[PDB]
Amino acid sequence: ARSEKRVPMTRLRKRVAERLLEAKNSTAMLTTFNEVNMKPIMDLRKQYGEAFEKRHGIRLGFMSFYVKAVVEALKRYPEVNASIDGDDVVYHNYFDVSMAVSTPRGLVTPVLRDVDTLGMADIEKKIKELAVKGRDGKLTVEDLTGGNFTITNGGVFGSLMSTPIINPPQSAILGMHAIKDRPMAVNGQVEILPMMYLALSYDHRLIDGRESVGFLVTIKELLEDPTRLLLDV
Amino acid sequence: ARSEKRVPMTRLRKRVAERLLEAKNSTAMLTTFNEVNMKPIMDLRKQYGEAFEKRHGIRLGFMSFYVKAVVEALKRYPEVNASIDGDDVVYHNYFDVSMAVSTPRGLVTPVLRDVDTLGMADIEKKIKELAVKGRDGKLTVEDLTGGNFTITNGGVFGSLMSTPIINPPQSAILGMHAIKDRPMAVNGQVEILPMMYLALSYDHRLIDGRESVGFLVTIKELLEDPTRLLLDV
Amino acid sequence: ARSEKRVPMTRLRKRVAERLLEAKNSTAMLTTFNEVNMKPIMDLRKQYGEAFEKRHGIRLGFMSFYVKAVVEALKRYPEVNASIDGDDVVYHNYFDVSMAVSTPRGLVTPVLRDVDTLGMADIEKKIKELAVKGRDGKLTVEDLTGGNFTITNGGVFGSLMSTPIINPPQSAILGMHAIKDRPMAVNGQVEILPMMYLALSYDHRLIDGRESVGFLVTIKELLEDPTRLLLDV
Amino acid sequence: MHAIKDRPMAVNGQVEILPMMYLALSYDHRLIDGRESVGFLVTIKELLEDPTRLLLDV
């Protein structure tokens, strides 16, 4: 009855475990949090969903909006788009974003490369290719060769809020969560809105509290009014 | 005036401090969070409190509901009911749950053993015995010989939300908090409900984001409708 | 196009990075959270702002209220006003509070010394001197010689909630955040209030969950009714 | 482009006063056909009434 069952870890399983622990102890990870109102994007999908699919051949999703917001944030705060290499701080000056996809054996993070020049239709198509290969277990090491910044999305599982973990040599990670209806204060009235928490884990020995808050405030602002991506405000 | 006072730490005090720090640095601890509506259980206590006491000789409390929810969650996600021993992942296949009780000199965690076969009346009686011995400082090392999972409750102190710390060799811990009235969105209306935050700290090198969120979603669901423990839904 | 830019870290920049990482790995940092209703203080500023300025020559701000609340909390929970020195726990028996100010090159934390004997007007004047020297980059090492407890304020940047980092040899830190309107449950009604989250990061190998929650509950209570500082309740 | 002037308009079965502007497109018919001229002017109308469509490319 009261008997255990032991399974030796594979050399792959142990190496992943060791790398995670070394990353944990080699970085001074801290986490900041915020909330974003998602109704403005849900309205856009509801209004232009069919026209977008008819013109481009792929559905308009939420992911394409997150990538554009992150790219603009990485332009305004370069220190988030950087990493430490020994004694040197390396500024990349280009925009590769890792994104987590679910394989049959857990989440893996392929890279969207040169995302600053893609359109929204291109991003959605590129994400679909990575998603299908990930589900098929067909991603190569080249696709997983890391970028500068990571987006992970725990909303599919129904998470409210959590602390994401950085993926070295990257210095920061953005965690998306479930969208849930909550009462909110709007111009002195109480209104129920679809709200989502944002979590940013960052390496404090490179990024300061000013930059982390400003980076996450920028993402909040661009998601609540995508027109600001056009105005650059 | 500006003078310090120094107290050498006892060898017991230092050993506890050292063990905590080693645990902190030997595990990749992360925390996920969620919220649970507690009114359904408060109604059950209000309706069946006297009948339960008259039949069983002990009052119906909240703790007996948390233990049953945790046991069902540990069945659905075995990876939370496991620990790492060197190169091996050990699956226990039995259900021992540690629970924190307040001694005169801080919290201590005796073990509820084989909680899957006990009824709610038995759990409440077993918790009362541990509580009285803990207050009396009369627990033996056998009672503190650890289990597989820990429940800690900071609600008595009035905490809103916090990050609990794992107790090795265990891999996860559940933190309960204070129950506080908050406005909530229910079917498009705003309703004030007694709400509690849940916090789960887990060792990421063993448990993944899917399992941690699913584990905490399961507990939320079972506490908001205990009848689901009967249906197994 | 896809070309990096490398900047060697100055010996000052590396030393700060190393000290932060050593602090991270040498302490068992945990964080508790709470929320405070700020309207009672905003009313006091609105009512007595002009009279206070006319009598004392300086404006009544929020910072003077936070310092008084912290000092009273440090009296009720001495274990927060302490640090570990090798094998000894050192109780300071005096009240020096570090406070973060923004320089042109990031936040720095000068010390308010013997804050228990100052009045609110004195605290505001002392904070203004440190603020001007910090903006001028004119603080000496004597001003930065650390105290017993730190207050950091991320509200100016617009942060909702975050995890602050301890500054050794200190054992705890208090993080203030942005004040934001939220609907709240008050005597069965829904009322929009200006609310702020509080975050306390503490060294668990010295401070226990009881003390951390009690310390943060005390601050919440004193800020929601400053008259309790007079009654000592 | 012309002056912006308030006019009553039909919006989802209601009458609402809106700031409206007329657009005029003069085109060389021996190169451009009626399809292109109308489509060109319809596109401008759509992008001005919701600039977010410049981001979506719809």
For domain C2-230, which CATH number applies: 3.30.559.10, 3.30.1540.20, 3.40.1780.10, 3.50.50.60?
3.30.559.10
Q: Which residues contact A195 (CB under 8 A, 6 or more apart)?
A: A35, A36, A37, A38, A179, A180, A181, A182, A184
Rounded distance, CA C46 to CA C60, Å?
10
Q: Within 13 Å of residue A35, how many CA atoms lie on the same side as its CB?
A: 19
Residues of chain B in Cβ contact (below 8 Å) with chain A: 25-28, 30-35, 84-85, 87-94, 114, 183-185, 188, 190, 204-206, 208-210, 212-214, 216-217
Which residue, C81, C62, C52, C89, is CA-closest to C176?
Answer: C62
**Under an 8 A CB cutoff, do A158 and B217 touch?**
yes
Yes or no: say if B202 and B30 are a contact pair by the CB < 8 Å rule: yes
Distances (CA, A) of B35 to A194, B106, B223: 16, 27, 11
Lookup: tokens for C169 = 């040899």
Yes or no: say if B124 and B63 are a contact pair by the CB < 8 Å rule: yes
Lookup: tokens for A221 = 């602002």
Type and span of the H or E element at C222: helix C209-224
What are the φ/ψ torsions at residue B181 (nearest 5 degrees)?
-75, 130
**Under an 8 A CB cutoff, do A157 and B209 touch?**
yes
**Under an 8 A CB cutoff, do A209 and C157 touch?**
yes
Which residues on A lie below 8 Å from C181 (Cβ)?
Answer: 185
Active-site residue set of B: 204, 208
Q: How far is CA B59 from the centre of its chain?
A: 20
**Under an 8 A CB cutoff, do A26 and C21 touch?**
yes
Task: List the single best residue of B10, B20, B201 to mutate versus C (max C Cβ within 10 A).
Answer: B20
**Orientation of helix B209-224 relative to helix B39-56, angle to 10°:** 60
The DSSP bridge partners found for residue C189 are: C186
**Under an 8 A CB cutoff, do A44 and D52 touch?**
yes
Rounded distance, CA B92 to CA A5, Å?
6
Burial class (CB in 10 A: 0-12, 13-18, 19+), C86: exposed
Rounded distance, CA B141 to CA B110, Å?
9
Structural domain spans, chain C: 2-230
Q: Which residues contact C185 (CB under 8 A, 6 or more apart)?
A: B181, B182, B183, B192, C191
Total residue length of chain B: 233
* B50-53 own/partner pairs: CB under 8 Å, 24+ apart: B52/B121
The DSSP bridge partners found for residue B30 are: B202
Q: Which residues contact B98 (CB under 8 A, 6 or more apart)?
A: B109, B110, B111, B112, B146, B147, B149, B150, B151, B167, B170
Residue type, A82: A
- Evaluate whether chains C and D are touching (3 or more beta carbon pairs less than 8 Å apart): no
Rounded distance, CA C18 to CA C161, Å?
26
Lookup: tokens for B233 = 């839904």
What are the φ/ψ torsions at residue B57 (nearest 5 degrees)?
85, 10
Q: How far is CA A117 from the centre of its chain?
A: 18
**Under an 8 A CB cutoff, do C163 and A30 touch?**
yes
Rounded distance, CA A187 to CA A209, Å?
29
Rounded distance, CA A217 to CA A194, Å?
18
Lookup: tokens for A5 = 């069952």
**Under an 8 A CB cutoff, do A230 and D56 touch?**
no
Residue type, B117: T
Total CB pairs under 8 A between chain A and C: 96
Q: What is the resolution of this structure in A?
A: 2.5
Give the nearest partner residue to A229 out of D53, D55, D57, using CB atoms.
Answer: D55
CA R_g for chain A: 19
**Under an 8 A CB cutoff, do C93 and B3 touch?**
yes
Yes or no: say if B208 and A106 are a contact pair by the CB < 8 Å rule: yes
Rounded distance, CA C220 to CA B4, Å?
28
Q: Which residues contact B200 (CB under 8 A, 6 or more apart)?
A: B31, B32, B33, B34, B172, B173, B174, B175, B212, B215, B216
Looking at chain C, which residue has its C-alpha nearest residue A147? C2
User: What is the b/e burial string over D6-27, where b = at least 16 CB atoms within 10 angstroms of the residue's CB?
Assistant: eeeeeeeeeeeeeeeeeeeeee
Burial class (CB in 10 A: 0-12, 13-18, 19+), A107: middle
DSSP state at residue B156: G
Which residue, C97, C93, C92, is CA-closest to C71?
Answer: C97
Q: Within 13 Å of residue D16, how many CA atoms lie on the same side as its CB?
A: 8
SS3 of residue A192 by DSSP: strand
Residue listed under structure tokens 């073990």: B111
Cα torsion at B95, B96, B100, B101 (round to 10°)? 120
Q: Which residues contact B122 (CB under 8 A, 6 or more apart)?
A: none
Rounded distance, CA A187 to CA A179, Å?
22
Task: List the single best residue of A67, A222, A227, A232 to mutate versus D (max D Cβ within 10 A).
Answer: A227
Residue listed under structure tokens 């969208």: A179
Lookup: tokens for C148 = 């017993």
Rounded distance, CA A230 to CA A180, Å?
28
Q: Are strands B149-153 and B97-99 parallel, antiparallel or unpaired?
A: parallel
DSSP state at residue A223: H
Minimal CA separation from C135 to chain B, in Å: 30
Which strands form B5-8's sheet, in the order they lie side by side? B5-8, C88-91, C82-85
Residue type, C54: K
User: What is the b/e burial string over B63-89, where b = at least 16 CB atoms within 10 angstroms of the residue's CB?
Assistant: bbbbbbbbbbbbeebebbbbbbeeeeb
DSSP state at residue B9: P
Lookup: tokens for C9 = 């870290």
Looking at chain A, which residue has its C-alpha nearest residue D50? A227
Helix (DSSP H) and strand (DSSP E) numbers for chain D: 2, 2
Beta strands in chain C (DSSP E): 5-8, 29-37, 82-85, 88-91, 97-99, 101-103, 106-108, 111-112, 149-153, 161-162, 172-176, 180-186, 189-203
Active-site residue set of D: 29, 33
Q: How far is CA A34 from the centre of its chain?
A: 14
DSSP state at residue A94: S
Lookup: tokens for B164 = 């609990």
Q: Which residues contact B124 (CB under 8 A, 6 or more apart)?
A: B56, B58, B59, B60, B61, B63, B64
Other CB atoms within 10 A of residue C176 CB: 22
Give the nearest partner residue to B107 out of C33, C188, C208, using CB atoms.
Answer: C208
The DSSP bridge partners found for residue C185 are: C190
Alpha helices, DSSP H only, in chain B?
11-26, 39-56, 63-76, 120-135, 141-144, 209-224, 228-231
Yes or no: say if B212 and B31 are a contact pair by the CB < 8 Å rule: no
A neighbours by CB contacts (3+ pairs under 8 Å): B, C, D
Rounded distance, CA B209 to CA B86, Å?
23
Total residue length of chain C: 233
Total residue length of chain D: 58
